[PDB]
Structures are given as C-alpha cells and as structure tokens.
C-alpha cells in the first residue's frame, strides 16, 4: 500500500461514497404499485438517474478530465451497462438499504424481460455475491470497468490504459494482501469482468424487446445506449 496508491484509493472511495442517488427517487421501488407497466417505469427512472450518477462519478476519477473529449464519450457508452450491472449486483449481494433489493428484484422479474435474459442476470448476481466483495473492490472494478480500452470506436487506447493501469495494480495488491487466504482473488474479480461483457448482448436484446412492445426510455438513456 504505497503512498502513491494508499491516498489515491481514498479519493476513489471518497467519490464512490458520495450519496448521489436521491432517496426520494429510490423509495419509489418500495412504495409504488407492482405491475408490469409500473415496474418498467420505475426501473427506467433509476437507471436514467444512475447514468447521471456514473457520469458524475466518472468525472471525479483521476486523470479522466485530461482525456480526449471525443474519446471520453466512447467509454461512457460502452461501459454504461456494465457499470450499472455492477451497482445493481452490489445491491442484491450487499443488501443496500437504498437498494430495496427484494422489491427491486420483484420489479426486475416483472418488467417484461425474457427468461433467457432473466436467468443469467440473476446467476451473475448470486455468484458475484458469493465472492464476498468488499466496498473497496466494488468501487475499484467500476473504475476499471469504465476505462476498459477494448471498448469499440476508440483510438487513444494507450492514454486510457495509463489511467487504468494504476487501478488494476491497486486491486491486485489489495485482494492478495487483504486476501492472502487465496491469490486467485484477482483472477476471480477480473474473471467477472468477462462475465459482465456477456450482458451487453443480453441488454441490447432486452432493449430491442422493450422497444418493440412500446416501451420508451429517457432522452439520456437513448443517447448513451444508442436508441433510435
């Protein structure tokens, strides 16, 4: 835990900790009626608000602002779902209070989402949870997930990579040192990053279905996910 790193994380957990999501909004997961229609309206609201929170959080990441303006957008579009899946997964596993996990689960399970997609998404939640990830880990991955250079329609992969590389290292250290019990923890964590990617096809297809069954998202969501 070098001083270069031991404070850098505190900046990051400082960001990750900022209670961006409005209680007034999340509360609707609990208080509103439960139906296919209402469930879907509720989830869009959370997701669109979350997209705002991610863009806020993403800014506060180190050396993000020094990035290419055109470049910056491609990371957000690509990493938006994976980031969203991380927090949503974080909720169920960690049973966050603002999460309303049980009731959030009910909504999701009756949002007009197919079983093909519902089964795996919920497998992922279970498995990632059994990992017993710390808050440190969650926030750190989210950062790693956002900066992944492999993301499509990018040019300056190296510039992001430098921004990313420090973070991978801090985790590499943290999991092994905090968890010498096993050294495969880094392997497990990064393994999931692959697992997340599986949902980008899943999610593109979920949007397609919703669309065709006359659901409509927000101007913000449509933009980030490239919805006609």
């Amino acid at each position: 835990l070098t001083p270069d790193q031991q404070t850098l994380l505190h900046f990051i957990m400082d960001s990750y900790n900022k209670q961006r999501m409005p209680q007034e909004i999340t509360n609707k997961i609990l208080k509103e009626e439960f139906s296919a229609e209402e469930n879907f309206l509720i989830l869009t609201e959370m997701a669109t608000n979350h997209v705002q929170v991610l863009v806020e959080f993403t800014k506060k990441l180190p050396g993000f602002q020094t990035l290419d303006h055109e470049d910056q957008i491609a990371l957000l579009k690509g990493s938006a779902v994976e980031a969203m899946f991380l927090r949503s997964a974080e909720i169920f596993n960690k049973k966050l209070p603002s999460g309303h996990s049980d009731l959030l689960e009910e909504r999701i399970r009756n949002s007009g989402i197919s079983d093909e997609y519902i089964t795996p998404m919920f497998s992922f939640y279970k498995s990632i949870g059994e990992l017993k990830m710390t808050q440190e880990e969650y926030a750190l991955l989210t950062a790693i997930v956002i900066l992944s250079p492999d993301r499509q329609y990018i040019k300056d992969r190296e510039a992001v990579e430098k921004l990313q590389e420090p973070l991978l290292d801090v985790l590499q250290k943290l999991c092994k040192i905090h968890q010498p019990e096993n050294p495969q923890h880094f392997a497990c964590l990064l393994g999931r990053l692959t697992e997340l990617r599986t949902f980008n096809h899943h999610h593109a297809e979920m949007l397609m279905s919703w669309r065709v069954n006359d659901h409509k998202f927000t101007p913000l969501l449509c933009e980030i996910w490239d919805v006609q």
Binding site: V55, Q72, I73, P219, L220
Partner: peptide
Amino acid sequence: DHQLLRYLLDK
C-alpha cells in the same frame, strides 16, 4: 452528435 452526455460532463 451526443449532445446530452457532453452537457452532463461540462455541467
């Protein structure tokens, strides 16, 4: 373009 995202960043 991607007008909304850009505004979000600068905002």
